Amino acid sequence: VPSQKTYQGSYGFRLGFLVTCTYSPALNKMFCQLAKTCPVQLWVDSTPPPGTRVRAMAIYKQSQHMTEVVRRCPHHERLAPPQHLIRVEGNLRVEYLDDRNTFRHSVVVPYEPPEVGSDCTTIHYNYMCNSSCMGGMNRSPILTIITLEDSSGNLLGRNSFEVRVCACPGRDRRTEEEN
């Protein structure tokens, strides 16, 4: 299984977050609706090298399920391959990748610096299956792992957040925070 370990790296890489999508810092958890815009901010302390790329991948949070590949349920599976949970919208250079050994899916875009008038780079992710989809995530928590990689694919930085894809993000966040 791919590592989830936070690695700020040489460029001081971290994530930020701004109901269709809501983030709980206390839980390090995003709650979002299926197919809706999920803004994830990339923050760096120094400019990454030319051709730096940003990869997103989902894994199960629980150790006992970590070897299982996160993919869309049969119903939802039937630019993006239909099996992929995570898509990117609003980007002309999206790559959908299937690992030849692990079969794990990921979605990659080029790293771009913040637009003029901004301090961070935003990527709009879409999650295409609900956490509750049986025959898929089966209510089991997932993590999204965001990796900053150089042009050769080498690790520059890593961060992660838990995700629940659900009908009522605000309500579920409140419940999970009360728990």
User: Does the annotation list 129 as a binding residue?
Assistant: yes
Residues numbered 60-79 forming contacts with Zn ion, rule: CB under 5 A: 73, 76
The two tokens of residue 24 are 């709980």
Q: How far apart are CA 101 and CA 85, in angstroms?
A: 19
Name which of 114, 98, 94 is nearest 106 in CA terms: 98
Q: Is 38 annotated as a binding residue?
A: no
> Whose CB is nearest to Zn ion?
133
Residue 133 lies near Zn ion (rule: CB under 5 A) = yes
Q: Which span sits near Zn ion by CB under 5 A: 2-10, 56-64, 125-133, 159-167? A: 125-133
> Where would I find the beta strands (DSSP E) of the chain?
14-16, 21-24, 29-32, 38-43, 53-60, 86-89, 95-98, 105-110, 121-127, 142-149, 155-165
| 133 assigned to a ligand binding site | yes
Task: Give 129 or 166: the residue with its C-beta nearer to Zn ion.
Answer: 129
Task: Say whether residue 32 binds Zn ion (CB under 5 A).
Answer: no
Q: Which is nearer to Zn ion, 61 or 76 (CB)?
A: 76
- DSSP lists the bridge partners of residue 86 as 127
137 touching Zn ion, by CB under 5 A: no
